[PDB]
């Protein structure tokens with residue numbers, strides 16, 4: 001049968017977790033206008049020649065909401081850790097999300113991808129090489145994305161699936 005992947009998108013408020021998830025699943029960019037909440041989004045894709053089902057949990061970046069935190073972190077198979085390249089604080093916050101995940105999973109080897117989003121904007125304060133250097137320290141892939149243009153979006157999620165598959169040997 002088809003394998004399903006429970007992917008969890010985490011990161012600071014406003015970095016574009018929802019917009020990435022909606023661009024991946026629905027192929028359009030949300031900004032000014034209203035939208036209905038779902039929080040869990042599903043998609044069939046072919047990655048490296050194997051069809052699979054993606055189940056994406058789009059988490060809140062507000063720290064005051066975390067009832068599901070140890071929940072959705074416990075049920076997730078891999079994590080997209082998102083910061084925005086114009087938000088130094090959200091890049092600094094990656095450490096805290098990676099530590100939360102490691103604790104909840106009780107593992108030093110959790111499938112994860114570091115995502116630097118909003119790479120269409122000119123106001124960059126996080127250098128690509130600095131984020132690459134951090135991802136190398138963790139041993140995980142780094143991808144730059146734009147939910148506005150779709151640059152990198154498929155690649156970020158598919159790379160996470162490839163990390164889960166590699167882990168599962």
Ligand SMILES: Nc1nc2c(ncn2[C@@H]2O[C@H](COP(=O)(O)OP(=O)(O)NP(=O)(O)O)[C@@H](O)[C@H]2O)c(=O)[nH]1
Nearest residue numbers: 013014015016017018019031060061118146147148
């Ligand atoms: N220029 C640009 N703006 C983006 C990009 N991704 C998201 N945004 C904008 O940034 C804002 C925050 O995006 P949103 O997806 O709601 O962020 P979030 O991480 O889910 N927020 P929260 O943690 O509050 O749930 C929105 O105005 C959205 O249009 C991107 O790649 N480029």
Ligand SMILES: [Mg+2]
Nearest residue numbers: 017018059060
């Ligand atoms: Mg959101």
